[PDB]
Symmetry: C2
Subunit: 364 residues, 2 copies
């Protein structure tokens, strides 16, 4: 409704947004069954992509959570996007509900959007992933440059759920769209569980993130399970980020590791002791080395745009959200057909804490 708007406005939740010629309202936060990242435009609403619960125990989780067989899809380690067509143009929305200047700039490189020309009702939900994205430092192990897009669900304008698995696969085959791997359809029987475990071991051995389970049912329930490798890397990856993150971030990922060790047994999981230790220590050691050398703690990011304008709009966008973290452009040079952007995320508080500690300071 519009009174829903009123309440969400006055109490911050929703915000007006001005970008790409457009004016619209964006729920910066989840509120009374309207999900985060729902975006109210003039002609329509692109609903927020709902949260997928995590299970920590594979067997007991699959058994408790699901009422029917379920599809097992790869969880690709990138960032969520929802793509749609508005007028004769195409827009990519981040999870937070902003129009992504990188993704939108790059759509024609990443995906054939004929599907939207012929089906303008659809919202394509896709993971964008690769070593040269502006949001995350990790990449799937099979993407070694630039970024790739992987469709994983279809939604519709002004509609909250998802096209059945079979309609999703129908549109992916018909329009030859790039997509997340379908591992198959399983159940939580002893035979299903054993095969899913075999998948997760392979995923772990190859550095893949995990899987998303999708119920073959009207309700179409989802859940995700993440490998120990990915949970470890999240710890490591976030060393420089420690002051910005709730403690919960870490005790949640510790629990994930510990519950896997409980599920599979200590004998087969001893190695995680050292590796958990290295996930914390090695990233922090790397933060200290960097501070000795550069007097700054930061991550460097690199990525490519068709248009100079969009690289600048990305630096702007990262700047509005991020705080105590300086987004500092390093380079923007035309390299062939693209503009190559290099920028640093500077962690000002970690920078001040390490310099204070290293110089012999006191902390309470």
């Amino acid at each position: 409704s519009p009174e829903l708007v009123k309440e969400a406005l006055k109490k911050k939740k929703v915000r007006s947004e001005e970008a790409f010629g457009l004016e619209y309202l964006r729920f910066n936060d989840d509120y009374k069954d309207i999900p985060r990242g729902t975006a109210i435009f003039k002609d329509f609403i692109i609903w927020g992509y709902p949260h997928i619960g995590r299970i920590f125990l594979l067997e007991t989780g699959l058994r408790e959570q699901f009422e029917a067989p379920f599809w097992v899809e790869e969880k690709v380690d990138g960032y969520n996007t929802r793509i749609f067509k508005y007028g004769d143009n195409y827009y990519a929305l981040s999870r937070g509900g902003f129009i992504c200047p990188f993704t939108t700039d790059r759509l024609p490189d990443l995906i054939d959007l004929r599907i939207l020309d012929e089906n303008p009702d659809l919202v394509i939900c896709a993971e964008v992933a690769g070593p040269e994205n502006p949001y995350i430092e990790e990449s799937p192990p099979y993407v070694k440059e630039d970024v790739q897009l992987f469709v994983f669900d279809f939604m519709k304008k002004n509609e909250q759920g998802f096209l059945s698995q079979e309609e999703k696969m129908e549109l992916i085959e018909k329009y030859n769209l790039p997509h997340v791997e379908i591992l198959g359809r399983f159940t939580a029987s002893e035979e299903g569980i054993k095969k899913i475990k075999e998948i997760l071991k392979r995923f772990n051995e190859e550095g893949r993130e995990g899987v998303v389970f999708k119920e073959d049912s009207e309700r179409n329930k989802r859940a995700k399970y993440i490998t120990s490798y990915a949970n470890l890397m999240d710890i490591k990856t976030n060393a420089k980020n420690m002051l910005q993150l709730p403690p919960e971030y870490y005790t949640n990922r510790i629990l994930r590791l510990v519950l896997f060790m409980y599920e599979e047994g200590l004998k087969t999981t001893e190695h995680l002791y050292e590796e958990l230790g290295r996930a914390f220590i090695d990233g922090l050691f790397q933060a200290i080395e960097q501070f000795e050398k550069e007097h700054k703690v930061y991550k460097t990011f690199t990525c490519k745009f068709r248009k100079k304008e969009n690289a600048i709009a990305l630096l702007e966008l990262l700047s509005k959200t991020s705080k105590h973290i300086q987004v500092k452009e390093r380079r923007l040079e035309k390299e062939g057909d693209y503009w190559r952007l290099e920028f640093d995320k500077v962690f000002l508080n970690m920078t001040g804490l390490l310099g204070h500690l290293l110089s012999g300071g006191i902390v309470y």
Copy 2:
């Protein structure tokens, strides 16, 4: 300190009136406008709160940065802080928070001879109480094999904020024969000083001691503390059951202590800390899961002794009022020799509910 500072903190809820052992008093629940937490205002005097000691993370550069004069090095004993004083013909013991501790107050006559207060009624004795049978802390120093023991490390004075000097302190302890924290000696941040202090921490660490407190031999009498990696590790482990009640920097903070020691000492010779840091998190939590599977609750058991039954009951009632989300649950209150033996559980309800939710295949949104 004055009347309208106290009036505003009663309104802002930094101070609260308590009553205990026949005494009615005002208690500083938090820091407020430089009045340290634990400050207790009695009608006849103020017992100032024990002030915060800062932590250095780099032993050599910290000592060199923080101190301008020589400094005494004392053992940091891992127990709980107590402030002990005379009122009328009675003696009382305050927790760091400023409550009159029914356990510590009950056991004063077994813990320490208080002739010193009789002869010097202005003194406040600052001591650590430590041992395996105390109600605040599961951990024990290794050299207290049972019950509890008390170790003086400072004197304060009624109505005053500072500390008796080292000399003055060492004289009172020698005169009245008080139990005291080990004194390592008087040092400077020179090359030689630093070599000796590092040998001391290496030894303590190998002996499982907590660390040391450094105390400037001067008027400003600046203090600083440094913790062994062993104690830092053990804190992470013994706090597993406690993880949902974690302040906004247990991670960044206890890990940085270990990481900066590794950096100071070299990462070649400190590699075993990887596995040890992993074990600290993983084995504490694994044990809380084993305990949950066995007893269907996640809890720590505490055991301690009183001269008076009313005091054990008063202790239970004190612990229920702090601890929310933590259930205090008596197991045993029984005569044992000339003492009432108390055993009780702190049940962590949130850890208990979370592990139950996850272990039966629950979903967590985040």
